[PDB]
Write an enzyme that holds these catalytic residues in place. Structure first.
Site, PDB file in Angstrom:
ATOM      1  N   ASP A  41      59.588  24.867  13.846  1.00  0.00           N
ATOM      2  CA  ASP A  41      60.005  25.160  15.222  1.00  0.00           C
ATOM      3  C   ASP A  41      59.182  24.362  16.227  1.00  0.00           C
ATOM      4  OD1 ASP A  41      61.392  27.885  16.875  1.00  0.00           O
ATOM      5  OD2 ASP A  41      59.888  26.657  17.871  1.00  0.00           O
ATOM      6  N   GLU A  85      65.826  24.166  18.389  1.00  0.00           N
ATOM      7  CA  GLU A  85      64.671  23.420  17.875  1.00  0.00           C
ATOM      8  C   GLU A  85      64.118  24.027  16.568  1.00  0.00           C
ATOM      9  OE1 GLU A  85      64.517  25.511  20.398  1.00  0.00           O
ATOM     10  OE2 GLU A  85      62.553  26.417  20.670  1.00  0.00           O
TER      11      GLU A  85
END
Length: 170
Positions: A41, A85
């Site tokens: 992430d 993301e």
């Protein structure tokens, strides 16, 4: 529509990933083998898009996908963009230690991109946090999603211990 991939990064998509993970979970259940998972992430990504725009954001995600498939050495490994993301990598036959080393490889490779960011302060570079989980699947009502849950818990650990690091479940 795309069948197995993500349009932006060209990695696997969520559906393709989940399906593979479930098969590998069941494989590992019958073999009683270790199955590892990385949830990856991008740090401060909201700030990044707000400041640099969604086009810059998308290009960054593309480069990070590159870092990720680079860590995806072995045929049995599979990498996806889980959403935004957030990325994921399944690592069959991989020990906690091996999973962690690979995550560190990915983390460092991301740093090697030197993508300029102004978080956590001016002159910084883009980084990722990574949650690692590994389990020998067990009995009862335990689905493959427990592995994702564990990695996501690891991810919170990494995100709250200062980011740019790997969190560990076990």
């Amino acid at each position: 529509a795309l069948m197995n991939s993500d349009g932006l990064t060209g990695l696997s998509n969520r559906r393709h990933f989940d399906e593979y993970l479930e098969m590998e979970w069941r494989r590992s259940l019958r073999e009683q083998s270790q199955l590892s998972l990385l949830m990856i992430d991008v740090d401060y990504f909201k700030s990044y898009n707000d400041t640099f725009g969604h086009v810059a954001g998308d290009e960054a995600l593309r480069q990070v996908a590159g870092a990720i498939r680079e860590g995806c050495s072995r045929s049995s490994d599979l990498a996806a963009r889980y959403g935004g993301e957030e990325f994921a990598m399944v690592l069959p036959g991989t020990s906690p230690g091996g999973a962690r080393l690979l995550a560190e490889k990915v983390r460092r490779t991301v740093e090697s991109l030197q993508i300029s960011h102004d978080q956590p302060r001016p002159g910084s570079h883009l980084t990722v946090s990574i949650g690692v989980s590994t389990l020998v699947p067990g009995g009862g009502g335990q689905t493959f999603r427990v592995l994702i849950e564990m990695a996501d818990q690891a991810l919170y650990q990494a995100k709250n211990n200062g980011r740019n690091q790997v969190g560990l479940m076990e």
